[PDB]
Amino acid sequence: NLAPLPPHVPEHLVFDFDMYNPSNLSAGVQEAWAVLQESNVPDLVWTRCNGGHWIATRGQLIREAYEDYRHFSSECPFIPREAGEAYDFIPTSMDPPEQRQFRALANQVVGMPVVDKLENRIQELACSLIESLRPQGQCNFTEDYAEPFPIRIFMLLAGLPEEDIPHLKYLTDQMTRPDGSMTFAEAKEALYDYLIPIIEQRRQKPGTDAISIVANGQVNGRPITSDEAKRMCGLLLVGGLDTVVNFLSFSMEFLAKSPEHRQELIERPERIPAACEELLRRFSLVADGRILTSDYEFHGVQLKKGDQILLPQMLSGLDERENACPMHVDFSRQKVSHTTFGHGSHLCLGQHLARREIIVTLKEWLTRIPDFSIAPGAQIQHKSGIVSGVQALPLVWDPATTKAV
Numbered sequence: 001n002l003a004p005l006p007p008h009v010p011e012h013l014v015f016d017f018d019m020y021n022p023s024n025l026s027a028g029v030q031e032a033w034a035v036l037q038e039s040n041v042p043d044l045v046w047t048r049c050n051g052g053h054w055i056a057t058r059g060q061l062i063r064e065a066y067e068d069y070r071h072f073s074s075e076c077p078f079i080p081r082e083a084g085e086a087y088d089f090i091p092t093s094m095d096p097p098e099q100r101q102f103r104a105l106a107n108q109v110v111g112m113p114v115v116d117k118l119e120n121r122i123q124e125l126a127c128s129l130i131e132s133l134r135p136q137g138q139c140n141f142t143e144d145y146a147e148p149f150p151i152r153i154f155m156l157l158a159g160l161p162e163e164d165i166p167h168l169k170y171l172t173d174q175m176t177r178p179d180g181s182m183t184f185a186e187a188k189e190a191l192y193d194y195l196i197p198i199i200e201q202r203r204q205k206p207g208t209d210a211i212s213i214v215a216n217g218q219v220n221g222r223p224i225t226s227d228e229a230k231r232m233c234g235l236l237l238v239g240g241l242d243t244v245v246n247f248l249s250f251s252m253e254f255l256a257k258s259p260e261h262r263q264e265l266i267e268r269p270e271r272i273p274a275a276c277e278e279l280l281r282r283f284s285l286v287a288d289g290r291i292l293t294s295d296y297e298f299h300g301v302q303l304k305k306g307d308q309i310l311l312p313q314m315l316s317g318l319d320e321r322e323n324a325c326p327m328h329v330d331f332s333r334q335k336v337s338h339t340t341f342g343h344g345s346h347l348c349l350g351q352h353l354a355r356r357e358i359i360v361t362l363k364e365w366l367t368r369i370p371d372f373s374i375a376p377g378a379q380i381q382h383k384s385g386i387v388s389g390v391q392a393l394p395l396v397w398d399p400a401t402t403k404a405v
């Protein structure tokens with residue numbers, strides 16, 4: 001379904017890329033998005049898919065747009081427009097100056113000071129989950145580790161029951177990779193339906209969990225409102241349930257398919273942090289955007305106020321202009337350039353927790369299960385959206401080659 005071409009968009013810039021179901025998805029989602037960087041494609045194109053929107057295809061433009069919030073507003077950050085308009089999470093739906101005050105509060109619940117504190121719980125859960133899987137010689141990685149590890153850590157931090165995960169995970173997924181049964185607005189309202197009573201309960205009787213902290217927090221000297229707290233907690237839930245969860249699967253899929261890279265990290269464990277960064281570049285997975293605040297000429301293209309522009313965070317690091325041999329995974333890559341965690345004033349606030357979860361996973365998995373592979377005859381299928389992922393990741397290994405710590 002292609003939307004009618006707006007009067008100001010020239011046909012030579014039309015490239016009908018569908019961010020929710022890209023044409024070359026079978027080759028891997030990053031590969032599918034990379035088609036936007038083929039020689040015949042302009043730096044900035046217009047797709048008639050998903051209501052019609054621009055797409056910046058090179059790191060230079062992506063970075064410039066994320067820095068220029070005066071022209072590229074985060075008030076409507078998602079495609080399609082209905083989703084971008086319903087999207088009201090804090091701080092993401094706000095532009096500076098208003099946005100700034102809320103970042104400090106979010107940092108208090110998912111920032112570094114919180115990670116170093118959860119250190120032991122994170123370490124222990126990773127080891128427990130992996131040791132239980134180790135003797136089985138197989139696992140469905142997405143449901144057996146990728147989901148439970150980061151999600152249970154988030155539910156613990158947020159003080160929410162693990163039995164609520166199926167419902168919350170479903171809702172979160174409808175906001176990033178909708179199956180069609182719910183509009184973004186309906187999923188958002190359902191998430192708020194869940195959160196409102198909890199936020200009120202915790203404003204009445206404060207706990208030490210993340211929701212209590214946000215709900216009773218202050219923003220630049222004054223009390224946060226119940227509405228603001230809800231809009232912030234909603235965002236934290238999405239971040240905890242649909243980011244690292246997907247990234248871990250892209251990384252494990254790659255390691256399962258590349259014995260040489262596994263051996264490198266097994267023989268030189270000190271390279272894991274660097275490997276984490278290279279994997280974050282190669283398997284970057286987020287793509288949201290902004291809305292034009294006024295008519296603006298950007299890199300020779302006339303943009304109109306109201307136009308939506310997708311600025312794929314995923315593409316910067318895959319841009320050959322930023323990293324040579326972009327599809328290659330080089331743990332010794334000198335300068336790892338990427339915008340995987342964003343760029344500009346909205347730089348990811350959960351990246352410290354994310355890196356910890358990634359590094360702990362790499363270390364603890366390779367320590368116990370150094371040799372593993374994709375299950376016999378399995379064809380790994382990816383899924384695309386605001387956050388891309390892996391549909392299923394069946395892995396196998398010989399228990400005799402494992403180590404119980």
Ligand code: HEM
Nearest residue numbers: 091092110239240243244247340341342346348349350354
């Ligand atoms: C692999 C893991 C992750 C990736 C790739 C990632 C990526 C991003 C990106 C690209 C943005 C910028 C969005 C924009 O500019 O519209 C962002 C913002 C944010 N992220 Fe993450 N993220 C990850 C994990 C997390 C986690 C685990 C949390 C906490 C639960 C988190 C919390 C946030 C928050 C609160 C913001 C909003 C910052 C603002 O709008 O000021 N993220 N993230």
Ligand SMILES: CC1(C)[C@@H]2CC[C@@]1(C)C(=O)C2
Nearest residue numbers: 092238239286288386387
């Ligand atoms: C684009 C993001 C990855 C970032 C954290 C969760 C997410 C889906 C948002 O809505 C802001």
Ligand SMILES: [K+]
Nearest residue numbers: 075084085087
């Ligand atoms: K909005």
